[PDB]
Design a protein around this ligand. Sequence first.
Ligand code: HEM
Length: 291
Amino acid sequence: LVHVASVEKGRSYEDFQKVYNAIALKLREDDEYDNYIGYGPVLVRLAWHISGTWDKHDNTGGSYGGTYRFKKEFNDPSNAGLQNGFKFLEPIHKEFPWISSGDLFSLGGVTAVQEMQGPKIPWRCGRVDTPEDTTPDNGRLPDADKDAGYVRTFFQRLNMNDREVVALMGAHALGKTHLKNSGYEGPGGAANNVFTNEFYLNLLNEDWKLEKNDANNEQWDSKSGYMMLPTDYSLIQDPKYLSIVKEYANDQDKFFKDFSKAFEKLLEDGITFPKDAPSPFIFKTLEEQGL
Ligand code: HEM
C-alpha cells in the first residue's frame, strides 16, 4: 500500500480551524462526563487507537482510512469505552460533512491536548476514507499486563524508538482506567484533565504496591489513591526508559517538545504527503481567539 494524502476539496486553514473551534466548544460544554474529568482524555485515547493499528511492514492500518467507523474495528475488545468519544464527535461530523473520518478522529486528539493546556501539536490534513475491507483485523493494539521488553518490541512495529515511547506514555497522566472497559481501575495522579509531567513524577515519587484488583488483574497501587499499569511500571524497571522518565520529571518543557513531535509522528504514520500539500497547520486555542 501507498496512501497518498488528498486535501478535502477546496478547504483551507480557516475551515479546519472551525472544526477545531467546534470540538473545543463542546469540550467546554460537556464538562460533566466521567465524574467531571470531561471528554479530553477519551478523545486523545481515540486518536492513538485509530493510529496504533499501523504496521510498517505492509503499510496496513494507521489513521488514514478512518476504518474505526466499521463494525470490526469499532467492536474490537481493545477499543471498549471509545464509543463515548465517537458519540461526542458525531454531531460535529454532521455540522462539517466534508471532513474525512481519519482527519476528524485525529484532530479530536490534537484539540483535546491543546485545550488541556498541552503543547501545540502541528496537524496535517489529507486522510481519505477507505472501504470496509481495508479495516485491520483485531489484535494489533498492545496488552497492559506485560513488561518493558514487550513495550519496546511493540512500538518498533510503529517505528517509535525509546524516547518517543516514553514521551507518548506521558499521556497516561490524563483520565483513568475503568474496570468495565479494560479490567483495570483507577486514576494515575491528581491533575487528570490538565496536561503536565505528572505521570513521571508519580512514577518516581510514589510508594507503589503490587495488588490484584476486582477483575483479577495486577496493578501497581499507591497510598495516595493512584494506579499504574504493569506496562507503565515497566518504564522504571528498564534502565534506558528510566533515564528518560527522570529527564521529563525534571523538565516539563522538554517533555512537551518531545510529546509534540512524537504524537504528530504517530498520527501521520503510513501516509505519504506530496510536496504540493499544505505545510502542517498550528491551530489557535479558544483562549487565543477570545472565544
Ligand atoms: C503500551 C501502551 C499502552 C497500553 C497497554 C495502554 C493501555 C491503556 C489502558 C488499559 C487504559 C484504560 C482504558 C479504560 O479502561 O478505559 C488506557 C487509558 C488511556 N490511554 Fe493508554 N495505553 C498505552 C499507550 C497509550 C498511548 C501511547 C496514549 C496516548 C498517546 C495513551 C492514552 C490513553 C489515555 C489518554 C487514556 C485515558 C482514557 C480515559 O480516561 O478514558 N495510551 N490505556
